[PDB]
Amino acid sequence: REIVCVQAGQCGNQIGSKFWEVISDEHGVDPTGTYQGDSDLQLERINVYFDEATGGRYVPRSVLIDLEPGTMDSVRAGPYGQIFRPDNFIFGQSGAGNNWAKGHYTEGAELIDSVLDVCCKEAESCDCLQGFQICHSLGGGTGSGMGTLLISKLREQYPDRIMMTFSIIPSPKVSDTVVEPYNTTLSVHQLVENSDESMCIDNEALYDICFRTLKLTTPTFGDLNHLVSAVVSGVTCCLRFPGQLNSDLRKLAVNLVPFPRLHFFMMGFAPLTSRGSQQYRGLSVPELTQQMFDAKNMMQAADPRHGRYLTASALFRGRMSTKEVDEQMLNVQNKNSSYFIEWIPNNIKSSVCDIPPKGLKMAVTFIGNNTCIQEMFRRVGEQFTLMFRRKAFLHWYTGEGMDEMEFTEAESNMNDLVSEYQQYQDATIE
Template identity: 75%
Template sequence: MREIVHVQTGQCGNQIGAKFWEVVSEEHGIGPDGVYKGDLDEQLERISVYYNSTGSNKYVPRAVLVDLEPGTSDSIRSGPLGSLFRPDNFVFGQNGAGNNWAKGHYTEGAELVDSVLDVVRKEAEGCDCLQGFQLTHSLGGGTGSGMGTLLISKIREEYPDRMMCTFSVVPSPKVSDTVVEPYNATLSVHQLVENSDETFCIDNEALYEICYRTLKLTTPTHGDLNRLVSIVMSGITTSLRFPGQLNADLRKLAVNMVPFPRLHFFMVGFAPLTAPASKQFRAVTVAELIQQMFDAKNMMAASDPRNGRYLTVAAMFRGKVSMKEVEEQMNNVQTKNSSYFVEWIPNNVQTSQCDVAPKGLPMAATFIANSTSIQELFKRVNEQFSAMFKRKAFLHWYTQEGMDEMEFTEAESNMQDLVAEYQQYQEATAEDVAEYEEEAPADDDE
């Protein structure tokens, strides 16, 4: 019931995806060979959200692994979870996208997309009641961004009424992997604004800071960063998979989080995050969780929520948590910091609860915020984009794959519009919003 089809594209998407399946398998008591080894009924009760059962106590992830070069999928196959995935669900090309969005979206990716869609269709048809799709990818590379967005729009065509959520790794402010990152990211956001229902923005630099500052890891590896992302990913769907007092699913989340269809880019966080050494000196209480999860240092995207206002917030608590206390503390946060919440959405914090805590923790919380400060992230990418595009630097790599300059101009202005929309609602008061609604009836027909 309520199944989710998971798609991972590109190197980044596949590495995050592999870590995610590690975390989820551990939660459901499934060994690296797919055989159930747990001892709790609730682990199997709704295991079908992410797994197909083969009947003989073996469970196979409902995952589609896509890449334009064989490297990453080979390393997943030879890794600890290699025999967990269904071999037919690996779909990979041989040429790679070479960090080029146009290759992923128009040439190399377009050749492979039909065979990917066949696998996706097969997985979707095996579901009782498909809830939606989740995609992990990065926006800076070629495959994850170019082919990832191509897949999103193709899946959207075929399943228009299903939720589409993406976990998108956005380029970091200081650390850049490739020089054409701003191009790839802008072209991708242009697609995500139109075709995704919920996009969780994650940023390597913010993750690195959390590992370094909060978890006190001196040399964080990509594995550590990916683990943080997968904890959040599992936290978002935890109330679908385990029993609880207040459940939430992808659609409920979207209904509560997206006040205007284009503004669906969320910041995420998780609590409690503590360094192993200081764990025993800290009690995990509801107040402590809430304090940490609203902390700017805890955000997994490099935007400071104090520079904007929260449109909406969702908090998912796990473990033996008193809902009364959660409600009280949440109201407390809202009344004390009312200037950071927009006043024209009165009860803009949604909470849900699930009885099963993550391994090794008495309770935990996943935090999702739709904050106007996410515009910092888009602004930053846009400035870098404009600087290069003004000189038409590196453009020939894209035009020789058949792209037109016009597409770049459109993507740029769409990104600027998005920033302007966030800014407009950040400054809006309750009276203003009523006026916008009267002035702008034309937006509905997009």
């Protein structure tokens, strides 16, 4: 059951470097590629993320795509950069210019065929292929346009597998780019049709995690990308280690998605605590469960108390009792019953894995399907309607070749997604 990862654009390549560092550390792979681990439990599932090259070496199943090689030279210069296969770096000669239309129509169609050849070469080598995993930002230029182009092509070529995405979306307060609403709206329109499961992260939530929970004095993008790499590496843990109650990406989708359009989820990771405080509190299932539902540890700006949970999933790593998990999930459902959708008799799925992440006795990652995600899309749609009524910067997109009808279609589709979430929020048994 092998996963193929795709990292696109600056954010994707930067998050990918830390993800592959975390994965290489847990399996004891040196930056030269040599296995140096100390237990057979590490070797027996190495195939899941690494292919074996001759005389000991392992190579990571990842495709790197970008329109300007600056980021690729930075990742090749990094401490683990050597592990990546040289033929897997694909780059052009001019930037996306923060424009969705360039990334989707002009340089996208020029490079996309070489990316499809690399993705097919990587997919057909697996004995059994599991879903793809993609990291990119929706606010950028090549990430949104070329990522969604490639997602559409892979969904045409492999419609029976799973499609999973991790995506960065613009903060309502911390904008980095003026034309963010257009790129975000077009990308969300593409994702809601093509994707099977989509996770959303706000940089503001990672800053609030660092300042309030970790009390870091001077955080850097390396810390934010480490938190993201930790949560990304945690969801797949039951695929690649033994446990008392195994779980899988398809089983997560079956328990989390009630209706096919409702596939947007919130993320959280529980054992976060400052270096000064850690000597004062031991790990236990109640402490992890209490932090896991605290909105302070949830990675989007929308708050759960303004919505309702349709479904949720918790994956536990470590040697621990199943009774405490079952009774904790029952207690949280019974005391806060108003925040759970009443026409589903049990909203939480649990899973237990024997091997915790290195240096922690136990850990849990949380995936949540909550209607409060509608608030982010509404904010993006308001800013889009303010900009679109006046054709504020539209000549760039029209000069690349886009018809105005795509903007009205993408706006209508996002408005219908917000309406469908709002209808399920206010649904009743009657």
